[PDB]
């Protein structure tokens, strides 16, 4: 999901 994607980018 994009939520985990954003958390990974952070
Ligand atoms: C995490 C949901 C945020 C909802 C508010 C934002 C909506 C507009 C942008 C789209 C955000 C998508 O996000 P995600 O991680 O791929 O959603 C996956 C959701 N399910 C597991 C139910 C399929
Ligand atoms: C900020 C308040 C959030 C409330 C919780 C909302 C949870 C659901 C988020 C859903 C985000 C999009 O996910 P997705 O994988 O593209 O959806 C697959 C299904 N559709 C193609 C019909 C959108
Ligand atoms: C403050 C919160 C902000 C959250 C913002 C999240 C945005 C997530 C956007 C994810 C976009 C992923 O698009 P992609 O796979 O590269 O497709 C690009 C498609 N075209 C080639 C037709 C342009
Ligand atoms: C938060 C954003 C996540 C996006 C992730 C998916 C990227 C790939 C999108 C591929 C579909 C691009 O056509 P659309 O946008 O449906 O065309 C809308 C415009 N018309 C009605 C004129 C056709
Ligand atoms: C602006 C670009 C800066 C580049 C430099 C990065 C420096 C290192 C930052 C390391 C941040 C590590 O992530 P975190 O806070 O533990 O996880 C954020 C997501 N959760 C809270 C859900 C776990
Ligand atoms: C609704 C549309 C409005 C227009 C949005 C225009 C802004 C699009 C920004 C797209 C930026 C793409 O960065 P990327 O290659 O994934 O790098 C991620 C960052 N690091 C390399 C440091 C990890
Ligand atoms: C509430 C949870 C928040 C989690 C936030 C996690 C991300 C932390 C990011 C830490 C940022 C560190 O920036 P800095 O060392 O000055 O590098 C900036 C480098 N550029 C100028 C090239 C972009
Ligand atoms: C750089 C820091 C970015 C922080 C982004 C925070 C986004 C939060 C989105 C939350 C949307 C709602 O989701 P939910 O399933 O009802 O949440 C249940 C969990 N809480 C009770 C803690 C909300
Ligand atoms: C809820 C609001 C959250 C907002 C979070 C904003 C995050 C923005 C991340 C910005 C990441 C920038 O990385 P950077 O090393 O300069 O990129 C690579 C650039 N060079 C190729 C020139 C080295």
Swiss-Prot record:
- Indicate the impact reported for residue 2 to A: Decrease in antimicrobial activity, but no change in hemolytic activity
Modified after translation how?
The C-terminal amidation is crucial for activity, since the carboxylated peptide has antimicrobial and mast cell degranulation activities drastically reduced compared to amidated peptide. However, the carboxylated peptide has no hemolytic activity, like the amidated peptide.
Keyword set includes Secreted:
yes
Q: Which residues carry this modification: Leucine amide?
A: 10
A GO biological process of this protein is:
defense response to bacterium
UniProt KW keywords: Amidation, Antibiotic, Antimicrobial, Fungicide, Secreted
Q: What is the effect of changing residue 4 to A?
A: Decrease in antimicrobial activity against S.aureus and better against E.coli and no change in hemolytic activity
- Specify the superkingdom: Eukaryota
Give Gene Ontology CC terms. extracellular region
Summarizing the annotation, the consequence of altering residue 8 to N is:
Increase in antimicrobial activity, but no change in hemolytic activity
Mutation: residue 8 to W; reported impact is:
Increase in antimicrobial activity and gain in hemolytic activity. In R5F/T8W; gain in hemolytic activity (EC(50)=2 uM). In R5K/T8W; Increase in antimicrobial activity and gain in hemolytic activity (EC(50)=130 uM)
**Protein name as catalogued:** Anoplin
């Amino acid at each position: 999901g994009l939520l985990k994607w954003i958390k990974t980018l952070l």
